[PDB]
Design a protein around this ligand. Structure first.
Ligand SMILES: NCCCCCNS(=O)(=O)c1cccc2c(Cl)cccc12
Ligand SMILES: [Ca+2]
Length: 125
């Protein structure tokens, strides 16, 4: 959990936090810990059209899980979304060998939000 990523979470207004909070609750649907785990990840990813395995699911969480928690909480959840945005938005550093996982974090949110097709006002974009 980098300070920059942490700041990004706090940089979110009440509406922004509320919107993400809703996704978090859904993400951890049935979660005993309340954090996004492999079980929750698999279900969420399944909706996105993915079929990752438990080992793969844990790896994903590990991507945003810097504390070695093993699960993605509210902090990691926002960080994961911010991480992707920060990349295209900035993409500073960029280690060698290139980066993998072209999965769109925004795309996942759309699946999680659902809304019977009409996910939020289309005018918002
Ligand atoms: N531009 C960097 C993209 C990284 C952000 C997304 N990472 S991801 O492995 O594709 C991913 C997608 C959806 C849910 C995830 C969760 Cl819940 C945890 C870790 C990674 C996840
Ligand atoms: Ca954690």
């Amino acid at each position: 959990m980098d300070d920059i990523y942490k700041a990004a979470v706090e940089q979110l207004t009440e509406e922004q936090k509320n919107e993400f909070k809703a996704a978090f609750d859904i993400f951890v649907l049935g979660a005993e810990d309340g954090s996004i785990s492999t079980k929750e990840l698999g279900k969420v990813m399944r909706m996105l059209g993915q079929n990752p395995t438990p080992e793969e699911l844990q790896e994903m969480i590990d991507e945003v899980d810097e504390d070695g928690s093993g699960t993605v909480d509210f902090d990691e959840f926002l960080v994961m979304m911010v991480r992707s945005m920060k990349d295209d938005s900035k993409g500073k550093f960029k280690r060698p060998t290139l980066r993998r996982v072209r999965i769109s974090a925004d795309a996942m949110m759309q699946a999680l939000l659902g809304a019977r097709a009409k996910g939020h006002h289309h005018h918002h974009h």
